[PDB]
Amino acid sequence: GAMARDPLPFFPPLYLGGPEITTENCEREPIHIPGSIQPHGALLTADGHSGEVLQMSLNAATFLGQEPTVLRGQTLAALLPEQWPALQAALPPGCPDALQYRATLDWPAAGHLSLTVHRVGELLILEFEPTEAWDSTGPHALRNAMFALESAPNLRALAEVATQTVRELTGFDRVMLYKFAPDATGEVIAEARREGLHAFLGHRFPASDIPAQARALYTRHLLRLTADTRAAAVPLDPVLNPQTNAPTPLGGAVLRATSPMHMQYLRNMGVGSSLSVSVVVGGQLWGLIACHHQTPYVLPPDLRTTLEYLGRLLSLQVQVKEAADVAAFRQSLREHHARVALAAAHSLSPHDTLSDPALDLLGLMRAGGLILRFEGRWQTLGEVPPAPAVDALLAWLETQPGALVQTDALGQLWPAGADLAPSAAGLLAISVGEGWSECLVWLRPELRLEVAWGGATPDQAKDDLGPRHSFDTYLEEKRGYAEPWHPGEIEEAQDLRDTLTGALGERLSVIRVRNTFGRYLTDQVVATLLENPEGLKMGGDRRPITILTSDLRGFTSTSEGLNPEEVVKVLNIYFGKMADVITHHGGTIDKFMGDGILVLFGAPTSQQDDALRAVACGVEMQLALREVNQQVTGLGLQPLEMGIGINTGEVVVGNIGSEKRTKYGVVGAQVNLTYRIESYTTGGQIFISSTTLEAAGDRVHVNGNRTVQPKGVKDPVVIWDVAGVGEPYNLSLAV
Amino acid sequence: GAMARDPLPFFPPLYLGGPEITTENCEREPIHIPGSIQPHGALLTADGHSGEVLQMSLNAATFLGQEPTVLRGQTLAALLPEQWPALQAALPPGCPDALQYRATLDWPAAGHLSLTVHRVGELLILEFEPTEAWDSTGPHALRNAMFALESAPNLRALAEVATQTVRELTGFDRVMLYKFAPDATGEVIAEARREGLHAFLGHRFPASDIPAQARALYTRHLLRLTADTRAAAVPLDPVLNPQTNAPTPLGGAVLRATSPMHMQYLRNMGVGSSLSVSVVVGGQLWGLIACHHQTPYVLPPDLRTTLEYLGRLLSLQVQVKEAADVAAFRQSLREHHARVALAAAHSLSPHDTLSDPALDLLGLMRAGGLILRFEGRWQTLGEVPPAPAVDALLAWLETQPGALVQTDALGQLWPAPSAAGLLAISVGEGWSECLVWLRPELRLEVAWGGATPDQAKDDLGPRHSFDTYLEEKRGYAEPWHPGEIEEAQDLRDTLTGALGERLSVIRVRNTFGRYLTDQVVATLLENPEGLKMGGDRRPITILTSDLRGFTSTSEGLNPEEVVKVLNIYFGKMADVITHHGGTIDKFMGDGILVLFGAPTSQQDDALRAVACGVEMQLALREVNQQVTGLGLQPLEMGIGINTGEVVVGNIGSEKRTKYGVVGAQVNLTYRIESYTTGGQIFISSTTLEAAGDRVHVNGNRTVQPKGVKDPVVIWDVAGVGEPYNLSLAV
Ligand SMILES: *C/C=C1/C(=C/c2[nH]c(/C=C3[NH+]=C(/C=C4\NC(=O)C(C=C)=C4C)C(C)=C\3CCC(=O)O)c(CCC(=O)O)c2C)NC(=O)[C@H]1C
Ligand SMILES: *C/C=C1/C(=C/c2[nH]c(/C=C3[NH+]=C(/C=C4\NC(=O)C(C=C)=C4C)C(C)=C\3CCC(=O)O)c(CCC(=O)O)c2C)NC(=O)[C@H]1C
């Protein structure tokens, strides 16, 4: 950004053999050390401790009415017997160079003088200038303006009051408020002017009309002027400070000679006199009050002080009015902003929430297209570039520093993307966390706009070796720019980025609970578990739980002759319906081992009807397979068949994983027994153990039984064939 | 926070039957509508459209030089023939009541008068004051003050210039800068005064000395004065505005009579004249330039305007100076800040990064104790109260709103000793992950100007004593520096911004393998494509293990022995499997399933799987030392490995995916393991072929497990050669 770019190193001044200044090298003119002054005042420099005079402007003798011999090598003690002790008191040695001291002198000849002093290291710089010794303006003009500035209701009105007041105070033929853009171009956003004068209002001027080292200088010394655009500069004698054998810094002297480049610009523009006051906001040059007179004009010093004070006042009020205008913009989005904040705040699946048309993330930013990248997938709303180009933008976005990126001409910030101006000329992108792995990208189409320039566009700065001669309206078509993002839209995006980034709190814990307690647990069960962290006895515990295992009989063998995509599709269908059923019965899915399911009832938390719910779950799982086999045989494949075993008993519960990556699981002979029980089933059948049937109760309807001695058990056991469950399930296997 | 709390509703004023004002209700005094003015000026009110004069102060004739009947019911057009068109243009209908217009008048029997006008609703309010023949040589004192304030190096120095300059401009016997705290107590942070006056510098004063409705009014109308603290008010006549039959709002008139309660305070303090100017920063009352004279003093209006100018400049520079003071505090901490900023940004296990003493989160904030809650658990550095108080503090911090909680007296915020000061930041929203800085008690003595806030309602009028009253505060820590608040917010921003990076790795590990290395997770994220979630048939090598008979022996162990043994076993097996790039797929009871080929495949999948199996068997030697140390029997382990085409893809539901494998070659692996005995590794012929000549074998078996159409040869593995050089001990 040209405004946030320090000036180039300056070249040596002319009187040290520096180069001549043209529009090629003019950002390097050392305008702060011209070694000369404007002829309407006089300048002395003096040693800061002794007060010996070291330099005089060539006109100081004639100005201060003393022969040049006495003056040179006189002391300020003798030249200013009253003001010498005072400026020492006000400008103590070692004080900042910015500090200035002002006084009136009753001088022997031609009237009173205005004295302005400042210190630069070991050197005192004294400016002398005619004054009335009588404030022409009176007390009320400034006080009235200050209150009127503060009561202006918005930025535009504040600009009107500023230029209208300054022109009333000074009599200038033209007073402009000139506002710098981030690329250091500027625009006349208010103008008060004498009748019959050409209007510059609404015109943009190239950044080169005020070069970077002038803008830097104007950030530190807030007023400067050219009283007479025809007047020759007056040299300092000697031109170098003899304390240093180096140029005398003159940036803080209002009598500093103006650059010949700018002198010529003002003549071309028809200007006899010029003055500007910096508006500085947050340490940055926000703009200028820029004044012109058609004929030479020396603004009296007291009028200048009024201006300098208005400068300070305007610097604060520009900030106040800009914040109020932004807040008013956001005030009209309040209803919509709250609604978007509430949804984003607690949402655990951002993709389904932020793409809802009822949320209208597109309208919230007046965007033409929105990209949402969350988890691993990105979807879009509205007008976006073809899918190949969206992936190229997200790839370049990942390289951008920060968590917010904003531009109204994406083609310039990212060259390869200049082709995407029909839908992505402007872009506002925010990163949920750092790295752009999750982000939102509002896009805006190219908006062709005409720009009124003051005589020339920025690329015509070097057509001549000097300033241009025309400042009349020059229209240029703007290419590749979108409508700019309002500062309130920038803020809205910052608010929403913060909300989603905060929401990563839950999105990390619930995925961490599922890793420990159940990969397929419901968002309610996880919520239930987060509230009650204790009671779970991670270090180990033995207690009763019911275990259910199922397998698809021979599906692993029939899957060696299907498409790999058919297998995955069939397993996805099956597990989907199975998981819905098991969830409905409060079971914890513990493993999806191939085509087999293990379900726990009682871990992570138990209830008195664990066994009954497991049996009912088993029945409905079998019934659910009939719905599943419609799609499978719909796809052209053979029906699936399923056997289920259920056991109930004491198992060891706890962190059965490792220490660094825990898993709440169960271990013991009663787990293994469930598999042996399931191994006695055929398709459609459910075998349960005697402990399960006993624990489940009289609501379980059995078909018959078998005594079996599975390998792994010392004693024979009776297993029971389930036909159904009664109230309140009323679930029955078909026969 | 009494500063950001609106005033209470005022009570009706006395002349409408309201209650007498005492220290019981003085926050309800309607000080903006006294119906009266101070006697060094005169006041008219007129209709905003016709200019008809509606009220006059009772002294208006003496001031304006015309008896009341010629003034009353006359029109401002006739009375101010030049100023009437001007003040209408400056004060248009609807303008803010803050907006003021001033002019000078020259009248007979009246000298030069200052006329200050402003508009309240449909009413114009005109104030008349003696003023001076204009003779200034220019605003030199202002210009010099302006640059002196701008060059002040810090906030203390800025305050010193302001009071020094105001005293030089005015002659006031005492000039103070009075800075409000968030609780609306105030402190005199700079003072310029007569030598014979008792110093108030450094003293704090109760919030009630400037009540909430004075503070609110002082945020809109930036100057008020009491010219003579013994001068009697002058009634308005009539007292009520006839447009409304309601009181006339005088908040915006400098001549407004001062609250009687405050007049008595000034007298009790020995003050003869008073004036203060608001410092308003970001729309908030930051403080007052507060001035006392021991004798009466009517400041001419032109000199008040210079004070008003300095108030505006000082509102700007207080902002500039406080920021620079904070930036200078943090500049000392820069290298330390960068050091913590780097660590917290890229950490995927913040518990081990932040507890590092070389990171020095305690010293960064100059704290005595630090709590660190991340993921499931919490942990503490330095001096922390016990685990009940930490679990109770962490529970209560979930109560607090926002992401940052800052106090220097935790006993007051939360009733329930190493922690008198607390600074807490929420990583994300809700405090599920947070940092808590704790500071111990710092016995400080507050110097109060006469009395503590407890003694506000001791008598029905103001206090008489304003001498130093030292009060010992208990349960307090050294206050958090504003730079230390900014450092905590920065660190909170960083850790919260690192949640996205922490999120990407747990999402991937949740899909592709729970125990995956933080290194291979980075691999899957820079190359996310080609994984083929829809389905694919690829060769992979599969390794299954079991601890034979441990399921039975565990029925005789205490459950805590069972979990401890499995934790030791799995923890060692995981180390070995990860060293060999295996993907632990399931911890099935005491069994492990490991994939070599998923999610990614190298060309030596089979060899690594065989060598991993050998090392797991060897690693069981170091496990069986800890298991027998605990007094238990030693574990035995059998291993089977198979290599074959399997279906690879999303095997879970569509909603909760899991990258898994399915097929007969997966199931054959468990059958191959079932033939092993303790200490033995059986592998299939396809594994032996893919692994290559570096595998050392003992013998072989032809087996035909059911569910298999054709017999298969399995091979007993003795060890692995270069570069592994592992052999099963024999
Ligand atoms: C290659 C160098 C160039 C150059 C140099 C230059 N310009 C300035 C200072 C100013 N230029 C201003 C420009 C404007 N005045 C207007 O009235 C408008 C629009 C209506 C514009 C854009 C202004 C305002 C200033 C500030 C000075 C002032 O207030 O008069 C300097 C610095 C002068 C100095 O302080 O010594 C220099 C070196 N101007 C170019 O256009 C090219 C040729
Ligand atoms: C129960 C009511 C109380 C009360 C009322 C009250 N106080 C004010 C205004 C001011 N009080 C000030 C206090 C101080 N002056 C000092 O010099 C110091 C410290 C050294 C303090 C704390 C100040 C500065 C003001 C502003 C007025 C001024 O500049 O003199 C009002 C409002 C006055 C008005 O605008 O009419 C009221 C109602 N003060 C209490 O102490 C209790 C009794």
Q: Residue B139: which of A126, A138, A254 has the closest Cα?
A: A138
Q: Is B480 helix (H, G, I), strand (E, B) or coil?
A: coil
Residues 6+ apart with CB under 8 A from A506: A346, A348, B428, B430, B432
- Best of A160, A299, A495, A508 to mutate (most B CBs within 10 Å, chain B): A508
Q: Residue B362: which of B345, B347, B389, B381 has the closest Cα?
A: B381
Task: Determine whether the interchain pair A556/B648 forms a contact, defined as Cβ–Cβ distance below 8 Å.
Answer: no
Cross-strand pairs, A552: A642
Task: Determine whether the interchain pair A657/B587 forms a contact, defined as Cβ–Cβ distance below 8 Å.
Answer: yes
Task: Determine whether the interchain pair B497/A501 forms a contact, defined as Cβ–Cβ distance below 8 Å.
Answer: yes
- DSSP state for residue A446 in the 8-state scheme: B
Among protein residues, the one whose CA lies closest to atom 26 of ligand 1: A276
What CA–CA distance (Å, rounded) separates B701 from B681? 12
Burial degree of A721 (CB within 10 A; 0-12, 13-18, 19+): middle
What CA–CA distance (Å, rounded) separates A108 from B10? 63
What CA–CA distance (Å, rounded) separates B186 from B285? 11
Find the CB nearest B506 among A315, A438, A512.
Answer: A512
Contacts of B571 in chain A (CB under 8 A): 658-660
> Chain B closest CA to A696's CA: distance in Å?
24
What CA–CA distance (Å, rounded) separates B263 from B270? 11
Q: Residue B597: which of B613, B586, B608 has the closest Cα?
A: B608
Helical axes A301-331 vs A334-346, angle rounded to 10°: 60
- DSSP state for residue B281 in the 8-state scheme: E
Chain B residue at shortest CA distance from A403: B497
Find the CB nearest B502 among A508, A564, A565.
Answer: A508
Residue ranges of alpha helices (H) inside A369-448 are 387-397, 410-413, 421-424
Tokens of B183: 């609780």
User: How many other C-beta atoms lie within 10 A of the C-beta of residue B13?
Assistant: 19
Whether residue A1 contacts residue A183, with contact meaning beta carbons closer than 8 Å, is answered with: yes
Please, what is the Cα angle at B356 between B351 and B359, to 5 degrees? 115
Whether residue B672 contacts residue B714, with contact meaning beta carbons closer than 8 Å, is answered with: yes
User: How many other C-beta atoms lie within 10 A of the C-beta of residue B22?
Assistant: 13
Whether residue A455 contacts residue A470, with contact meaning beta carbons closer than 8 Å, is answered with: yes
Q: Residue B543: which of B579, B589, B621, B597 has the closest Cα?
A: B597
Query: Which of B177, B201, B210, B220 maximizes ligand 2 atoms within 8 Å of its Cβ, making it the mutation to test the pocket?
Result: B210
First to last CA, chain B: 78
Peptide bond into A108 cis (omega under 30): no
Chain B residue at shortest CA distance from A575: B653
Q: Residue B656: which of A7, A502, A434, A580 has the closest Cα?
A: A580
Which DSSP helix (H) or strand (E) runs through A163? helix A155-170
Residues 6+ apart with CB under 8 A from B60: B42, B43, B44, B68, B71, B128
Whether residue B324 contacts residue B333, with contact meaning beta carbons closer than 8 Å, is answered with: no
Read off the amino acid at residue B531: L
Q: Is A456 in the pocket of ligand 1 (CB under 6 A)?
A: no
What CA–CA distance (Å, rounded) separates A268 from B445? 70
Tokens of A230: 């025809």
Peptide bond into B599 cis (omega under 30): yes
Whether residue A408 contacts residue A481, with contact meaning beta carbons closer than 8 Å, is answered with: yes
User: How many other C-beta atoms lie within 10 A of the C-beta of residue B602?
Assistant: 10
- DSSP state for residue B7 in the 8-state scheme: P
Which DSSP helix (H) or strand (E) runs through A181? none
Experimental method: X-ray
CA of B229 to the centre of ligand 2 (A): 12
Q: Residue B248: which of B131, B127, B67, B128 has the closest Cα?
A: B127
What CA–CA distance (Å, rounded) separates B388 from A320? 49
Tokens of A269: 């523009």
Cross-strand pairs, B373: B378, B434
Q: Is A272 in the pocket of ligand 1 (CB under 6 A)?
A: no
User: How many other C-beta atoms lie within 10 A of the C-beta of residue A490?
Assistant: 17
Query: Which of B198, B265, B307 maximizes ligand 2 atoms within 8 Å of its Cβ, making it the mutation to test the pocket?
Result: B265
User: Phi and psi dihedrals of B689, rounded to 5?
Assistant: -70, -45
Q: Is A88 in the pocket of ligand 1 (CB under 6 A)?
A: no
Contacts of B313 in chain A (CB under 8 A): 312
What CA–CA distance (Å, rounded) separates A587 from B320? 63
CA of B263 to the centre of ligand 2 (A): 8
State how far the alpha carbon of B560 is from the alpha carbons of A93, B555, B591, in Å. Answer: 79, 12, 19
Q: Residue A107: which of A125, A69, A80 has the closest Cα?
A: A80
What CA–CA distance (Å, rounded) separates A497 from A504? 11
Q: Is A259 in the pocket of ligand 1 (CB under 6 A)?
A: yes
CATH code of the domain in which A662 resides = 3.30.70.1230
Q: Residue B450: which of B433, B468, B436 has the closest Cα?
A: B468
Which atom of ligand 1 lies at the shortest distance from residue A256's CA? 36
Contacts of B434 in chain A (CB under 8 A): none
State how far the alpha carbon of A572 is from the alpha carbons of A593, A599, A637, B535, B564, in Å. Answer: 13, 18, 15, 11, 36
What CA–CA distance (Å, rounded) separates A250 from A228? 19
Give the DSSP per-residue string, B248-262. Answer: PP-TT-TTBPPPHHH
CA of A301 to the centre of ligand 2 (A): 40
State how far the alpha carbon of A342 is from the alpha carbons of A508, A515, A526, in Å. Answer: 19, 28, 21
Q: Residue B553: which of A689, A667, A665 has the closest Cα?
A: A667
User: Phi and psi dihedrals of A471, rounded to 5?
Assistant: -120, 20
**Cα dihedral sign for B61, B66, B70, B73?**
negative
Among protein residues, the one whose CA lies closest to atom 3 of ligand 2: B209
First to last CA, chain A: 80
Residues 6+ apart with CB under 8 A from A619: A686, A722, A724, A725, A729, A731, A732, A733
Residues 6+ apart with CB under 8 A from A16: A247
User: How many CB pairs below 8 Å do chains A and B form together?
Assistant: 311
> Chain A closest CA to B536's CA: distance in Å?
5
Resolution (Å) of this entry = 2.3
Peptide bond into B182 cis (omega under 30): no
> What's the number of CA atoms in the CB half-sphere (13 Å) around residue B77?
7
> What's the number of CA atoms in the CB half-sphere (13 Å) around residue A178?
26
Q: Where are the beta strands (DSSP E) in B25-100?
A: 36-37, 42-47, 53-57
Task: Determine whether the interchain pair B376/A512 forms a contact, defined as Cβ–Cβ distance below 8 Å.
Answer: yes
What CA–CA distance (Å, rounded) separates B221 from B205? 22
Q: Which domain holds residue B686?
A: 503-727
Give the DSSP per-residue string, A287-315. Answer: EEEEEEESS-----HHHHHHHHHHHHHHH
Burial degree of A609 (CB within 10 A; 0-12, 13-18, 19+): middle
Chain B residue at shortest CA distance from A500: B428
Residue where the block lists tokens 């200035």? A100
Contacts of A98 in chain B (CB under 8 A): 147, 150-151
User: How many other C-beta atoms lie within 10 A of the C-beta of residue A709?
Assistant: 11
Q: Residue A666: which of A596, A608, A602 has the closest Cα?
A: A602
- DSSP state for residue A232 in the 8-state scheme: P
Pocket of ligand 2 (CB under 6 A): B 23, 26, 29, 31, 186, 188, 200, 205, 208-211, 214, 224, 226, 258-259, 261-262, 265, 274-276, 288, 290, 449, 462
User: Phi and psi dihedrals of B4, rounded to 5?
Assistant: -90, 35
Find the CB nearest A568 among B144, B376, B647.
Answer: B647
- 3-class secondary structure for A26-89? HHHCCCCCCCEECCCCEEEEEECCCCEEEEEECCHHHHHCCCHHHHCCCEHHHHCCCHHHHHHH
Whether residue A67 contacts residue A284, with contact meaning beta carbons closer than 8 Å, is answered with: no
Read off the amino acid at residue A439: C
CATH code of the domain in which A58 resides = 3.30.450.20
Among protein residues, the one whose CA lies closest to atom 23 of ligand 2: B210
What CA–CA distance (Å, rounded) separates A308 from A280? 12
Whether residue A721 contacts residue A678, with contact meaning beta carbons closer than 8 Å, is answered with: no
Chain A residue at shortest CA distance from B310: A309
What CA–CA distance (Å, rounded) separates B256 from B249? 9
Whether residue A117 contacts residue A87, with contact meaning beta carbons closer than 8 Å, is answered with: yes
Burial degree of A562 (CB within 10 A; 0-12, 13-18, 19+): buried
- A365-376 burial: b if 16+ Cβ within 10 Å, else e: bebbbbbbbbee
Tokens of A187: 């625009």
Is B26 labeled as ligand-binding?
Answer: yes
Contacts of B514 in chain A (CB under 8 A): 515, 661, 663
What CA–CA distance (Å, rounded) separates B729 from A532? 48
Residue where the block lists tokens 């909170």? B492
Tokens of B272: 């003869």
Which atom of ligand 2 lies at the shortest distance from residue B23's CA? 1
Contacts of A668 in chain B (CB under 8 A): 551, 554-555, 562
User: How many other C-beta atoms lie within 10 A of the C-beta of residue B127?
Assistant: 25
Cross-strand pairs, A381: A370
What CA–CA distance (Å, rounded) separates B496 from B510? 21
What CA–CA distance (Å, rounded) separates B215 from B180? 10
Whether residue A82 contacts residue A76, with contact meaning beta carbons closer than 8 Å, is answered with: no
Peptide bond into B723 cis (omega under 30): yes
- CA trace torsion A56, A59, A60, A66 (10° rounding): 130
> Chain A closest CA to B535's CA: distance in Å?
5
Give the DSSP per-residue string, A355-385. Answer: T-TTT-HHHHTT-SEEEEEETTEEEEEES--
Q: Residue A470: which of A481, A456, A459 has the closest Cα?
A: A456
Find the CB nearest A151 among B96, B504, B662.
Answer: B96
What CA–CA distance (Å, rounded) separates A439 from A429? 7
What CA–CA distance (Å, rounded) separates B344 from B364? 14
Residues 6+ apart with CB under 8 A from A329: A486, A487, A488
Contacts of B577 in chain A (CB under 8 A): none
Tokens of A466: 């000097």
Helical axes B301-332 vs B155-170, angle rounded to 10°: 170
> What's the number of CA atoms in the CB half-sphere (13 Å) around residue A10?
18
- Best of B566, B657, B669 to mutate (most A CBs within 10 Å, chain A): B566
Residues 6+ apart with CB under 8 A from A186: A178, A179, A180, A204, A205, A207, A209, A210, A287, A288
Please, what is the Cα angle at B207 between B205 and B211, to 5 degrees? 125
Residues 6+ apart with CB under 8 A from A732: A619, A701, A723, A724, A725
> Starting from the edge strand earliest in sequence, which strands make up the sheet with A223-226, in order?
A223-226, A273-281, A284-293, A174-180, A186-193, A204-205, A449-454, A473-478
Whether residue A84 contacts residue A51, with contact meaning beta carbons closer than 8 Å, is answered with: yes
Whether residue B180 contacts residue B157, with contact meaning beta carbons closer than 8 Å, is answered with: no
What CA–CA distance (Å, rounded) separates B463 from B468? 13
Which atom of ligand 1 lies at the shortest distance from residue A21's CA? 1
- Best of B404, B662, B669 to mutate (most A CBs within 10 Å, chain A): B662
CA of A155 to the centre of ligand 1 (A): 24
What CA–CA distance (Å, rounded) separates A426 from A413? 10
Contacts of B429 in chain A (CB under 8 A): 345, 502-503, 505
Tokens of A474: 């020059």
Whether residue B651 contacts residue B662, with contact meaning beta carbons closer than 8 Å, is answered with: yes
Chain A residue at shortest CA distance from B432: A505
